[PDB]
C-alpha cells in the first residue's frame, strides 16, 4: 500500500532506506537503491579486536 512518507528506493516489498550499500529485500528495485546481494547479513567492523578481561 502507498504511504505518505519520503524514500528514494522502492521495491515490491515497499520502500527501503538506502543508507546501507546492499539490500536483501528484492532484486526488483526503483530509484536510488542499494545493490541486491544473496547474503542476509554482512557485518563491517567499526572497532578493534575485542579481548575482554579474564
Amino acid at each position: 500500500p502507498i504511504d505518505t512518507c519520503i524514500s528514494e528506493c522502492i521495491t515490491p516489498n515497499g520502500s527501503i532506506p538506502n543508507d546501507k550499500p546492499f539490500q536483501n529485500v528484492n532484486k526488483i528495485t526503483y530509484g536510488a537503491c542499494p545493490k541486491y546481494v544473496k547474503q542476509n547479513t554482512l557485518k563491517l567492523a567499526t572497532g578493534m579486536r575485542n579481548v575482554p578481561e579474564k
Binding site: K43, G47, M48
Partner: protein, 172 residues
C-alpha cells in the same frame, strides 16, 4: 593482528576505559591513575569513519530495467533475462563478500598498528630511563610524579634530566 600488540603482548583490554580507544594506566608513589590517548584514538577513528564511502561512493540510480519475474514460459528470451540477472546477482554478492572481508582484515590490522605505534612512541620518549617489561607496560626507573607522567602522555617528556638517576637505578 599483524603486529602482535592487540591480543598479543598487551594480552588484555580495559573495560574501564571509556574515555578513548587507547590510553595509559600509570602507577607511582602518589597512586594509580588512568588516562586516554586522544591522538591515537582520533587517528584510528578517522581512518575507520569512512572506509566504505571510499570504494562504493554511493548508490547509483536505476529507473527502468528488465523484467525479473515471469508468469508464463517463453523460452530463449526469458532464459537470457534470467541468466543475466542471476549472473549480476552472483557477481555483486561476491563483490560484497570480498569487500567486507578485506575491510575487516584491514581494520583489525589498522587498530593493531595504532596500538603498536603508541607503544613505540612511548618507548622512544623513554630513551634509557625505562625498560619494557614485555606485557605492554613500562617500568620507569626514577621518581616520576603525576607531572612526570602527564609529560610522558603529553609527548614532552624530558629524558635528559632523569638520565643519571635512571641509569644508576638500572645498572647499579
Amino acid at each position: 593482528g599483524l603486529f602482535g600488540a592487540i591480543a598479543g603482548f598487551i594480552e588484555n583490554g580495559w573495560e574501564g576505559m571509556i574515555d578513548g580507544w587507547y590510553g595509559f594506566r600509570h602507577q607511582n608513589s602518589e597512586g594509580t591513575g588512568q588516562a586516554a590517548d586522544l591522538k591515537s584514538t582520533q587517528a584510528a577513528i578517522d581512518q575507520i569513519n569512512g572506509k566504505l564511502n571510499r570504494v562504493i561512493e554511493k548508490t547509483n540510480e536505476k529507473f527502468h530495467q528488465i523484467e525479473k519475474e515471469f508468469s508464463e514460459v517463453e523460452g530463449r528470451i526469458q532464459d537470457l533475462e534470467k541468466y543475466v540477472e542471476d549472473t549480476k546477482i552472483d557477481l555483486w554478492s561476491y563483490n560484497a563478500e570480498l569487500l567486507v572481508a578485506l575491510e575487516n582484515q584491514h581494520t583489525i590490522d589498522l587498530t593493531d598498528s595504532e596500538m603498536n605505534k603508541l607503544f613505540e612512541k612511548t618507548r622512544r620518549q623513554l630513551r634509557e630511563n625505562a625498560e619494557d617489561m614485555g606485557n605492554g607496560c613500562f617500568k620507569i626507573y626514577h621518581k616520576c610524579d603525576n607531572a612526570c607522567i602527564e609529560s610522558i602522555r603529553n609527548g614532552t617528556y624530558d629524558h635528559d634530566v632523569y638520565r643519571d638517576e635512571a641509569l644508576n637505578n638500572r645498572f647499579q
